[PDB]
RNA sequence: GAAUACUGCCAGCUGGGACUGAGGACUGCGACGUAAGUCAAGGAUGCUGGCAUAAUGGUUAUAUGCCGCCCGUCUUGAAAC
RNA sequence: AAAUAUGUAAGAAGUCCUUGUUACUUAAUUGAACGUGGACAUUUGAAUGAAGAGCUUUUAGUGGGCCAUUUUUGGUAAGCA
């Protein structure tokens, strides 16, 4: 018959990695999570308690509950034609903070600093990001850079 | 189409680790600027580690023929892909300009080997400055002293659907 | 051919020109569609949309709700407006001297209001007293208090009132409702 | 209260200062266009004289025309065409050139023909097929009062002001472009020039980037 | 009631654009450029004529 | 009389007809599943805060 | 030292042909005019001829050119041998 | 160890400053959560588009499918599965 267990098809997903097996380092236990933090989920195969299901591997969610050794995380799961709210109790070995959130907060504080310093002059702050604009005019010189003519190479076996 | 020759000069995009790249130049026979720049990037992706996103084109210039009314003999070295492999060929064409010579070359390869524009690579084309360096008989035939020949069997196309006398093919 | 990003030819889905055949209601919506077209006050558009509504979208508004609305500060001399009916309430004992404009009044509500010194006003007299809704206060009854909305969205772990005729013991209190008989919902 | 002479004369006078402002603005736009293009030509000439090469700026504007019909389109290019407002064959739109829009153009490469429009074809498009979107209605332009009523908040007063905002891709290009209804062009008057359309323009077909040959195609279709 | 088209119909052309009258007056459509006697460099022309 | 076993054909089209609406997020999400020792103190903290604000703006 | 080709622009001029004439007092934006006013400026008017009847037209039969498989049903699929 | 697909973020329900509550927590006004008062507004925090956005009730038919490109399994293969 068919087989769809709780950890089916999780072979390479829950292998550890090359040459970093063994016990886990103490930074994962010394990291501090608060309610509202945004965290990434990546399971550790060395810890069998508090494991996430294989669906939530690589998923990103929001902390809603902090307990003794675990963290409650909220994920949005697509079920059919809508998203449902899923609450997960995961031990802290299987989560880490999302770095995109802290990058955005750094942008927020630097952006507020720019607005605060330029408010003393009113110099059209222009605080929105802009994407890659087309590159403008330039003059390239041939002083020591005379062009070299290239041609297609004929065919050879090369074995 | 009716071909034109362009020089296309381009380079890599300048970085802080290396400003002023080496400004490579190539001569392309193409119908227009877009096809010329596409073929330029095609051959530079075959030669060096660069692509269009990582590089730029600094110049494109049409090179028209210096003496468009001198009759030349050109030797052309060509790669083409057949149905089973890749071959090199050397063909020589007596014609008045480089773009017309490569146009007749493309027609000749498409006619005699069923090779398409995507399969033909033009290695080089060069004017043969001296006679008796011509090595093909079909062009060495036209280099003789006081060349003259008749044109037998003249066929004159008519405008009317009916002709009122038996036509003559004297020339 | 057009690659349509929406449904073509769809109705707006909002009811205009009410489905009732009441000639006095049609006169009232004629008056208030004139007022909504030309008085450029939002009150007239609000009461014009409220005039179209069906019976379950016009719940009754009690005199206790009217008095509770008048106990808001700075609202003691406003004109209460109910697009619908006004019923009385014997659970309240004192009533202020208000003016209430409404479609219908029950006999008890009209007696209570005019006994307290206030007055009952129709919508056209409301229009000629306050053409742009000056010093008014619109009240609405509770829509989600009907018996029918109890059964809306019935399912497992909803707590949402099964459609049943007879009640008591042995009418759906068993397997599927307590864990001693099978499971609990 | 005669009310047919004094207010009419005031309206005529107010139109006269509006016309004078439009006239001097168009004079300034014409002057800056011709000085800009002559400066580019002279910069190329001076680079050639000094022995360098003048790499001109990449174009900041493309015109995109839908070429393929509405049947059998994959969902991601279909959604990109709907977001670029090309829901009909022979429909055209200006796009500001950015990396974020170049990725969309790469996505819908096999169903559009796009290129760099010139001032002449921009002027002919706006003058012949010029339609604004006024409370979700397609209104022909035909008078400067419409344009100064709808885009006058963002400085645009006339049709040539709108043309200037399109060609010099200014701060309010997004507002001007979304005010402009998508251009409903016809089939080309001399044909497409190729026997078969749905190959790339490099392959001898029609889709892709005919980077500066879009002016001939759009002027034939317009 | 009817869309009259500019680039014909000079009345509606002048209605949309007042500058068209002085454009036609000064003949800016056919404007003569000022000639410059600049010559390209020898390195440019030998790079162009290089095989 | 064998038949078709399973397919996922047409399912994404059916979903994307009127489909893939994100759930409505709210201020003050539900406190169910939150730790009871936290909620038991949170009730008294909000009660004291409400009493202090009522005494301030009484 | 020129010309010409090629490509591109003109709010340059101008000839022929076809289809359409919706709307129905005025209002608007304009142009030429010092002004009165005029205009190709928010949709066709002016002049003329023949006929005033089966002439146009409608209907119907026939002929010609091109096209057109038998309906209803079950079915993934029916003109179905 | 790709390509293609795939999760999250791109603010006002935000950031910063100050100090109120608690029976939680700490050696400790230490912290946790929710707050009072104050400051930051149209470039309010990338692009493009929005055709209205959100929400609810009720009910029909359907629950034999098949074909094409690409990936792919069994089979010598199949207009096969
Ligand atoms: Mg196809
Ligand atoms: Mg064709």
Q: Does D82 touch chain C (CB under 8 A)?
A: yes
The topology (CATH level 3) of C14-145 is: Ribosomal Protein L15; Chain: K; domain 2 (3.100.10)
Same domain, B7 and B41: yes
**Residues sharing a CB contact under 8 Å with residue D28, sequence separation 6 or more, in sequence order:** none
Strand (E) or helix (H) holding C138: strand C136-138
What pairs with residue D53 in β-bridges? Answer: A140
CA angle, A151 then A157 then A159, to 5°:
130
Question: In this structure, which long-range contacts are made by residues A25-32, counting pairs with CB atoms below 8 Å and at least 24 apart in sequence?
Answer: A28/A92, A28/A93, A28/A96, A29/A92, A29/A93, A31/A92, A31/A96, A31/A97
Q: Residue A75: beta bridge partners?
A: A86
Residue B10: inside a domain: yes
Kindly state whether residues B139 and B79 are assigned to the same domain.
yes
Domain harbouring B131, CATH code: 3.10.20.10
**What percent of the residues of chain E are helix, what percent strand, and what percent coil, each to the nearest 5?**
45, 0, 55
Host domain of residue B75: 69-145
Helix runs in F3-58, H state only = 11-17, 36-56
Chain B nearest C-alpha distance from E38 (Å): 18
Cα angle: E32, vertex E37, E40; to 5 degrees: 120
Flag if A76 and F23 touch (Cβ within 8 Å).
yes
Distance CA E17, CA B71 (A): 56
A148: Cβ contacts below 8 Å, ≥ 6 apart: B22, B23, B24, B25
Q: How far is CA B110 from CA B83, B88, B118, in A?
A: 13, 15, 11
Cα dist from B145 to B133, B138, B141, B148, whole Å = 17, 16, 10, 9
Instruction: Quickly give B22 CA vs G1 C1' distance in Å.
Output: 39
Angstroms from B160 CA to nearest CA on chain A: 53
Question: Are the Cβ atoms of D55 and B32 closer than 8 angstroms?
Answer: no
Which of A141, A155, D139 minimizes the C-alpha distance to B19? A141
Using alpha carbons only, what angle is made at residue B52 by residues B46 and B55, rounded to the nearest 5 degrees?
A: 100
In a domain, B53, yes or no: yes
Q: How far is A129 from chain E (nearest CA, A)?
A: 38
CB-based contacts of B152, cutoff 8 Å, min separation 6: B169, B171
Q: What is the DSSP code (8-state) at residue C150?
A: G
What's the CA gap between D56 and B57, in Å, rounded?
A: 10
- Which of E44, E45, E46, E48 best probes binding to B when mutated, by most B CB atoms within 10 angstroms? E48
Q: Name the CA radius of gyration of chain E, rounded.
A: 22
CA nearest to A73, candidates A54, A55, A52: A52
Flag whether B26 is in a domain: yes
Rg (CA), chain F: 25
Say yes or no: B80 and B102 in one domain: yes
For A145, other C-beta atoms within 10 Å of its C-beta total: 14
d(CA C118, CA C63): 12
Q: Tell me the CA–C1' distance in angstroms for E1 and G51.
A: 38
CA-to-C1' distance for D156 and G8, Å? Answer: 30
Is the minimum distance from the CB of F4 to strand H below 7 Å? yes
Residue B76 sits in the same domain as residue B129: yes
Transcribe A93-131 into DSSP letters.
Answer: GGEEE-HHHHHHHHHHHHHHHHHHHHTTTT-----S---
- Residue D32 is classified by DSSP as H
Tell me how far the alpha carbon of residue B1 lies from the centroid of ligand 1, in angstroms: 26
HSE-CB for C58 with a 13 A CA cutoff:
19
- D209 and chain B in contact, CB less than 8 A: yes
What does the alpha-carbon distance between residue B48 and residue B70 come to, in Å, rounded to a whole number?
Answer: 37
Task: Check if residue E45 sits with its Cβ under 7 angstroms from strand G.
Answer: no
CB of C86 closer than 8 Å to CB of C106:
yes
A150/B123 CB distance under 8 A: no
**Which alpha helices (H) appear in E1-51, and where do they start and end?**
10-16, 19-26, 42-49
Residues B25 and B50 in one domain: yes
Q: How far is the CA of F2 from the C1' of H78 (A)?
A: 19
Question: What is the H or E stretch that residue A87 is in?
Answer: strand A82-91
Do B63 and E50 lie within an 8 Å CB cutoff?
no
- List the subunits that have 3+ CB pairs under 8 angstroms with A: B, D, E, F
**Using the CB atom, is residue E38 less than 7 Å from strand G?**
no
List the determination method. cryo-EM
Longest Cα–Cα distance of chain F, Å, equals 81
User: Is chain F in touch with chain C: ≥3 Cβ pairs within 8 A?
Assistant: no
What is the Cα gyration radius of chain A? 26
- B20 and A147 within 8 Å at the Cβ level: the answer is no
DSSP string, C160-177: -----SS-STTSS-STBB
Q: Note whether B45 and B51 are within 8 A (CB).
A: yes
Residues B63, B7 share a domain: yes
CA–CA separation, C36 and C38 (whole Å): 6
Closest ligand to D198 CA? 1
Instruction: Report the alpha-carbon distance of residue D197 to residue D205 in Å, rounded.
Output: 5
* B83 and B46 co-located in one domain: no
Nearest chain A CA: its distance from B132 CA (Å)? 25
* Cβ atoms of residues B30 and B36 within 8 Å: yes
CA torsion angle B47 B48 B53 B57 (round to 10): -80
Residue B105, in any domain of the structure: yes
Distance of CA D156 to the CA centre of its chain: 15
Report the residue of D57, D105, D106 to disrupt the A interface, i.e. the one with the largest count of A CBs within 10 Å.
D57
Convert chain B into a string of H (helix), E (strand) and C (coil): CCCEEEEEEEEECCCCCCCCCCCEEEEEEECCHHHHHHHHHHHHHHHCCCCCCCEEEEEEEECCCCCCCCCEEEEEEEEEECCCCEEEEEEEEEECCHHHHHHHHHHHHHHHCCCCCCCEEEEEEEECCCCCCCCCHHHHHHHCCCCCCCCCCCCCCCCCCCCCCCCCCCC
User: By CA distance, what is A145's nearest residue in D?
Assistant: D52
Distance between CA atoms of residues E50 and B26, nearest Å: 10
**Does B19 share its domain with B75?**
no
Residue of D nearest to C3 (CA): D87
Q: Do B24 and A151 touch (CB under 8 A)?
A: no
* CB < 8 Å to D90, chain C: none
Instruction: Mention every residue, 6+ apart, whose C-beta is less than 8 A from residue D24.
Output: none
Interface check E50 vs A, CB under 8 A: yes
Determine whether A117 is exposed, middle or buried from the number of CB atoms within 10 Å of its CB (0-12, 13-18, 19+). Answer: exposed
For residue D74, give the ligand nearest its CA: 1
CA neighbor of D46 nearest in space, from A154, E37, B53: E37
D67 touches chain C (CB under 8 A): no
- B62 in the same domain as B37: yes
The span from the CA of C168 to the CA of C103, in Å, is 41
Look at the block and give the residue holding tokens 């608060």. A34
- The torsion angle over the Cα atoms of residues C122, C126, C127 and C128, rounded to 10 degrees, is 100
Mutate to test the interface with D, among C3, C6, C12 (most CBs of D within 10 A): C3
* Three-state SS at C119: strand
The C-alpha angle D83, D89, D94, rounded to 5 degrees, equals: 50
Positive or negative, the CA dihedral D199, D200, D206, D208 is positive
Say whether residue D50 is in contact with chain B using an 8 A CB cutoff.
Answer: no
Nearest to A137 among D51, D57, D97 (CB): D57
Q: Which residues of A touch B22 (CB under 8 A)?
A: 145, 148
Measured distance CA(D180)–CA(D178) in Å, rounded: 5
Question: Do B85 and B60 belong together in one domain?
Answer: no
Assess if residue B163 is contained within a domain. Answer: no
**Strand H at less than 7 A from CB of F43:** no
Euclidean distance between CA atoms D73 and A84, whole angstroms: 31
A143: closest CA of chain B, how far (Å): 10
Q: Do B25 and E47 touch (CB under 8 A)?
A: yes
How far is C183 from D13, CA to CA, in rounded Å?
Answer: 86
Q: How many domains does chain B have?
A: 2
Any residues with CB less than 8 A from the CB of C138 and at least 6 apart, and which?
C43, C46, C47, C50, C81, C82, C83
CA atoms within 13 A on the CB side of B44: 29
Phi and psi torsions of D64, nearest 5°: -120, 130
Among the partner-chain residues A81, A84, A87, the one whose CB lies closest to the CB of F33 is A87
Q: How many CA atoms lie within 13 A of E39 on its CB side?
A: 3
Compute CA D193 distance to the chain's CA centroid, rounded to the nearest angstrom: 23
Q: Are residues B88 and B51 in the same domain?
A: no
What is the spatial distance between Cα A46 and Cα A21, in angstroms, rounded to a whole number? 8
d(CA D17, CA C31): 44
Kindly tell me the burial class for residue B167, based on how many C-beta atoms sit within 10 Å of its own C-beta (0-12, 13-18, 19 or more).
exposed
Q: Could you tell me the distance in Å between the CA of residue D7 and the C1' of nucleotide G27?
A: 13
CA A87 to chain centre: 21
- CA of F34: which chain A residue's CA is closest? A65
Indicate yes or no: strand G within 7 A of the C-beta of E19: yes
Q: Is F22 on the interface with A (CB under 8 A)?
A: yes
Minimal CA–CA distance to C177: which of C150, C147, C157?
C157
Cα D192 to chain centroid distance, Å, stands at: 21
Pairwise CB contact (< 8 Å): D58 & A140: no
B64 and B41 in a common domain: yes
As residues whose CB is below 5 A from the ion ligand 2, the structure lists D 195
Report helix, strand or coil for D200. strand
């Amino acid at each position: 018959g068919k087989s769809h267990g709780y950890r089916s098809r999780t072979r390479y997903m829950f292998q550890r990695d090359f040459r970093k097996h063994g016990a886990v380092h103490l930074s994962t236990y010394l990291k501090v999570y608060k309610v509202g933090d945004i965290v990434d989920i990546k399971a550790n195969g060395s810890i069998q308690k508090g494991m996430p299901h294989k669906f939530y591997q690589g998923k990103t969610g929001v902390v809603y509950n902090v307990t003794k050794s675990s963290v409650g995380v909220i994920i949005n799961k697509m079920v059919g034609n809508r998203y449902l709210e899923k609450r997960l109790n995961l031990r802290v070995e299987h989560i880490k903070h999302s770095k995109c959130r802290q990058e955005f907060l750094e942008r927020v504080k630097a952006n507020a600093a720019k607005r605060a310093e330029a408010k003393a002059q009113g110099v059209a702050v222009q605080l929105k990001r802009q994407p890659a604009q087309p590159r403008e005019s330039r003059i390239v010189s041939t002083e020591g850079n005379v062009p070299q003519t290239l041609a297609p190479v004929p065919y050879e076996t090369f074995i | 189409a009716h071909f034109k020759e362009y020089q296309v000069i381009g380079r890599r995009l300048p970085t802080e680790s290396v400003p002023e790249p080496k400004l490579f130049r190539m001569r392309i026979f193409a119908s227009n600027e877009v096809i010329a720049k596409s073929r330029y990037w095609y051959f530079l992706q075959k030669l060096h580690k660069v692509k269009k996103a990582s590089g730029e084109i600094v110049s494109i210039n049409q090179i028209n023929e210096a003496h468009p009314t001198k009759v030349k003999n050109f030797g052309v070295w060509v790669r083409y892909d057949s149905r089973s492999g890749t071959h090199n060929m050397y063909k020589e064409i007596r014609d008045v300009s480089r773009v017309a010579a490569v146009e007749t070359l493309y027609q000749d390869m498409a006619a005699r080997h069923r090779a398409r524009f995507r399969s033909i690579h033009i290695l080089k084309v060069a004017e043969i400055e001296k006679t008796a360096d011509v090595k093909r008989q079909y062009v060495k035939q036209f280099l003789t002293k006081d060349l003259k020949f008749p044109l037998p069997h003249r066929v004159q196309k008519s405008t009317k659907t009916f002709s009122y006398k038996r036509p003559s093919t004297f020339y | 051919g057009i690659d349509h990003t929406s449904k073509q030819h769809k109705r707006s889905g909002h009811r205009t020109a009410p489905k009732s055949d009441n000639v006095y209601l049609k006169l009232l919506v004629k008056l208030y569609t004139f007022l909504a077209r030309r008085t450029d006050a939002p009150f007239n558009k609000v009461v014009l949309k409220a005039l179209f509504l069906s019976k379950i979208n016009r719940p009754p508004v009690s005199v206790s709700r009217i008095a509770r609305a008048l106990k808001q500060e700075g609202a003691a001399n406003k004109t209460v407006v109910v697009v619908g009916t006004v019923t009385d309430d014997a659970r309240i004992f004192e009533f202020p001297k208000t003016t209430v404009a409404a479609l219908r009044f029950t006999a008890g509500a009209r007696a209570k209001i005019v006994k307290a010194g206030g007055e009952c006003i129709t919508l056209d007299q409301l229009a000629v007293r306050a053409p742009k809704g000056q010093n008014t206060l619109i009240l609405r009854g509770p829509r989600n208090s009907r018996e029918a909305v109890r059964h809306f969205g019935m399912g497992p772990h909803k707590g949402k009132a099964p459609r049943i005729l007879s009640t008591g013991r042995k009418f759906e209190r068993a397997r599927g409702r307590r864990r001693s008989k099978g499971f609990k919902v | 209260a005669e009310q047919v002479a004094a207010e009419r004369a005031a309206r005529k006078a107010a139109n006269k200062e509006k016309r004078a402002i439009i006239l001097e603005r168009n004079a300034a736009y014409q002057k800056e266009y011709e000085t800009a293009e002559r400066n580019i030509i002279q910069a190329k000439r001076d680079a050639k004289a000094a022995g360098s090469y003048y790499v001109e700026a990449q174009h900041k504007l493309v015109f995109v025309v839908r070429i393929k019909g509405i049947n059998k389109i994959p969902p991601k290019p279909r959604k990109v065409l709907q977001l670029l407002r090309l829901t009909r064959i022979n429909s055209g739109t200006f796009v500001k050139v950015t990396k974020a829009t170049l990725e969309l153009l790469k996505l819908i490469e096999p169903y559009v023909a796009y290129g760099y429009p010139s001032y002449s074809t921009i002027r002919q498009l706006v003058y012949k097929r010029g339609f604004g979107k006024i409370n979700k209605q397609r209104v022909p332009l035909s008078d400067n009062a419409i344009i100064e009523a709808n885009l006058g908040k963002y400085g645009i007063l006339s049709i040539d002001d709108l043309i200037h905002e399109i060609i010099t891709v200014g701060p309010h290009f997004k507002q001007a472009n979304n005010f402009l209804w998508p251009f409903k062009l016809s089939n080309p008057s001399g044909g497409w020039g190729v026997p078969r359309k749905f190959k790339h323009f490099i392959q001898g077909g029609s889709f892709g980037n005919r980077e500066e040959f879009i002016n001939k195609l759009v002027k034939s279709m317009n | 009631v009817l869309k009259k088209n500019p680039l014909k119909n000079k009345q509606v052309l002048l209605r949309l654009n007042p500058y068209a009258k002085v454009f036609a007056a000064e003949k800016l459509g056919s404007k003569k450029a000022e000639k410059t006697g600049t010559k390209p460099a020898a390195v440019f022309t030998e790079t162009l004529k290089h095989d | 009389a064998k038949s078709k076993n399973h397919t996922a054909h047409n399912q994404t089209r059916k979903a994307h007809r009127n489909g893939i609406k994100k759930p409505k997020t709210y201020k003050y999400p539900s406190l169910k599943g939150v730790d009871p020792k936290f909620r038991r103190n949170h009730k008294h903290a909000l009660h004291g805060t409400a009493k202090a604000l009522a005494a301030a703006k009484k």
